[PDB]
Every structure is written in structure tokens, then in C-alpha cells.
Amino acid sequence: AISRTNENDPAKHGDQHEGQHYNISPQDLETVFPHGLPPRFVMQVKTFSEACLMVRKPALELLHYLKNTSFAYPAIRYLLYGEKGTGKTLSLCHVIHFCAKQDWLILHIPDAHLWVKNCRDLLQSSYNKQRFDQPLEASTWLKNFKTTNERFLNQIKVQEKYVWNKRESTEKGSPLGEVVEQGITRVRNATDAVGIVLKELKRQSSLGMFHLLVAVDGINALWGRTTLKREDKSPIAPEELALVHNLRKMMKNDWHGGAIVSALSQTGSLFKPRKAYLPQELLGKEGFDALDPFIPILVSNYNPKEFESCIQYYLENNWLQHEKAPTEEGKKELLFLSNANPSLLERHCAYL
């Protein structure tokens, strides 16, 4: 009631809906978010059998910016930042849902930290002998990309011939889905296929064929360090990974026709202290220079209204099973123990 909004169109959300939960339909959830949703938020969808996202000011601000986007100008970079667990990822998801219902082409990188960390199969790129390719990481992403942008994957057609190997090759003019299918099928060409997909969407959005959203969660991974090591145990730089090298190019505002929304994350990062959350703190010198100029959007803890609306939404699902939680003294403790942090609250309520 007081925690839910009937407005399920992410394009008609205004300040009047702040604090209220809007329902992401199972259709959009399966299509727009086959990846990228917070793990603890994917658990909650299962147990409540519905995905309801709170309309908050961080996302509201972005929607505003992305409604007044001048597609003639270069791509604006927006950067969500905030302390751990404040809702940066679900703010970014709110936005993605918006653009997907506006028929933008979505280029969602679920978590970029995965690309600099825990890589089993690290092959030397054939296209460039100085770089490494990540078939597993590259293949996984392509499948999800295909899910989200299946309608547009045929209409879009390559503008150049890409030779996979001696035998196979994509010929100019063929549909883009064919390039994605090569990567999905031959994971040896998955990294090279991802490079081509990025190379085309950037080039063709400037031509005005579609609007492009580049949404990179955990963007601070691209200019940091990796835990990947060579055969001789020497550390590999993010510049050397073919998959990171190509995504870096998507972050420059030298293309137009879309927007670049990103979110920072210390969770899952490499070589960053627990409490680092400010943009230059997490990006470093190299990373900050690569995004200058960008518009920082702050995400913070629930304000008293947001906090109350969350509790009511948990009570409304009978999630708060303890006998004292509905009480006002129960709420005071939830509030204290979390400091209104969205993540601490959710984690605390998953057993109370």
C-alpha cells in the first residue's frame, strides 16, 4: 500500500514515487536482467516471487539526465558512488530498466571485477599476440547480451568483414547476431567477438541507428590491478587483457547517440581498502583521468522515509517473521544496527 507504487513504467517515475516500490515484471526481469542483479536481491525475488525496486533519488536524478540527453552531443559519463551497500547497483539497474523500455541498445557489464580476477582459461589473443583473451568470461557475457538485445541483433548489420579463422569469416553486411553466435559457439573467438560487438555499436550509434546505454557496474576495475598472473607468475596489467582493453574504449566520450552510466564498487575490487568509496579513491589516477569529465551521482543510506518504506515492504511479504520486528522498538533496533544502510538492513532482516 504505502510502500508500493502502481506506476510500473520506469519512464513515469518522479519525486512523488520516492520511497515506493515498483514491480519489475517477470518478462522484463527475464529479458532486461539475465545478469547484473545483486545476488542478495536475486534471492529475494525467489522468496517473494516478485522483483520490487524502491524508487530513490539517485536513480530519479539519472532518469532526469537520461530523458534530457542530447544525442547530438558526445556521450555523458555518469558515475554512481557511495559507501558499501547503499544501492549503487540497484540504482544502475533502475536506469537500465528505463532505457530498455525506451528501446535503447543496452551494453550491460554486470560486474567488471570478474574480468580482472579468477581466470582459469587465459589464452594468448591470436588477433594481437601482446594481449590475453578470456573465452569463459567473454562467452558468458555474449549469451546475456544476446538475451537482452535479441530484437535488435538482426536489424543491426556489420559494416566490415571480420575473419575468424582460415575457414570462417563474417562478411560485411551480415547481421550482428551472426557475430555474437560465433563467439557463443566458438568460445575461442568469444573475446574477439566481444571486441567486434563493441566496435560496431559504438560506430553505428554515432550513425543514429539506435540509442546506446553503456552500463558498467564495478567500473573501477578497468584501470586498477589484476590478480591474473602469466606463466612465469608475473602480474598482468588490465591494459593487456583484450576484454578490458576493448571495454576501456567504450568509456571515452568520442562517440555520441547514447549515454554511459557506471557505478563504483569496492566489493569485489582488487587492492582497495574496505572503506574506500570516493571516485578518485577507487578509480585511482589512471581511472579518474579516463572518465574526466563525468557527473558523479551520490548514493547514500536510506533516509527515514526510505527506511520505513522498506520495513513495510518486508512486513507486507511477511518476511519479518520475528514477533517483535513489527513493533516500533523493533524498528528502532533495525535502524540502529543498520544505520539505515540498505544492505545491512536486508541482511539483518533475512533471519529476523
Partner: protein, 208 residues
Amino acid sequence: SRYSPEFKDPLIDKEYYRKPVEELTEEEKYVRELKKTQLIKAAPAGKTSSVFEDPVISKFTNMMMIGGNKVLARSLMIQTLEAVKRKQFEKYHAASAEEQATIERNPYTIFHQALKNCEPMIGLVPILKGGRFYQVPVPLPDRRRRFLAMKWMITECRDKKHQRTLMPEKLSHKLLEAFHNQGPVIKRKHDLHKMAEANRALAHYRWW
């Protein structure tokens, strides 16, 4: 201990202190004034006044702690309470409107009852009589029943039979069985009950 025998234990109960003075009996009133003169031990870092405080969960958490690692012991505990709640929400959502009335989704109710179904009513005390030991049936104090129920549940979950099952998974499964009077911890209670009934003729060996 570093406390002298003079220090008394703290009573951490909000409502106890916020009870109307008139309701206090003459005896209850006196003890309340006596404590105004007594030294009180510092409240330990475990129990607080919170409304969510449960002494049975706290004891169960400590009984599964290894080497002072209470952050890990409690994380397992809350992951178990969460796994139980999620298993009971899946079962409730897939149940018919008639069955739904039955299904308990409160994990604290389930945990509390799950352990109460494992507590034994009688035990066995080895009594050395005539150079031979006899498992004599004896009544058990309530503390010992509640200890045994928790200890049997934890020892069952820590058995190596379970291959690569995480403790929150194992324990939530075992707690749900015991909630329905099933499983190997309920069985261990019955085997104890059967032993004691079989040796009911030896109960005269007890001298207390």
C-alpha cells in the same frame, strides 16, 4: 575470577526495572533496595537488552563455535535461520490455500520446537556395581536435557557422512526434520528412550 565474591550478576531486563513500584510485593521491594548497595559485575559482551535477543540461539551459537571464532559461529547461525525461513517460504508458496494454514515460517519457532522434540526425558548413568557397569535409567535435570538436544544436533551436523554440504545447509535440513519428529536426532532420542525402558529393572541401582 577477577571479580570478588561480592560482585553480583547484572540483571539485563528492561521490563523488570520499568515495573510499577506499587505492584512490587514487600519481599520483592526489599530485594530491589538491597541491590542498591551491591557491586554488580560488568555485563558481558554477549547478552544485551535487545528485543531480538534469544538465549537459546546464543547458547547454540556458542556450542558450535571453534577456537573463539564467534563471528563465524554467528554467521553460520544466521545463515541457518535464513535457510530455514527460505525453505519454509518456498514450501508455503507452492502449497494449497488449505495447507498454507499449517506451514510454520517463523525460523525461531521452528528452531525452538525442533530442539524441544529432541530433548530426552530419561537418561542413562553408568553405575559400577559388583565390578560391572550398568546403564541405569535416571531422570535428567532440565539443563542436561537442553544441553543434550543441542549437542546431539551439532554432533549430527558435524558428522563426516555429509560430503561438502555447508553447515547452514546441513543444519537447516536437520532442524526441519526434527521439527516434524523425524531424522536421526529424533531417532537418537528414541534409542535412548528404548535403552532406558529395556533397563527399567536396573533403576533400583540408583541411590538418589
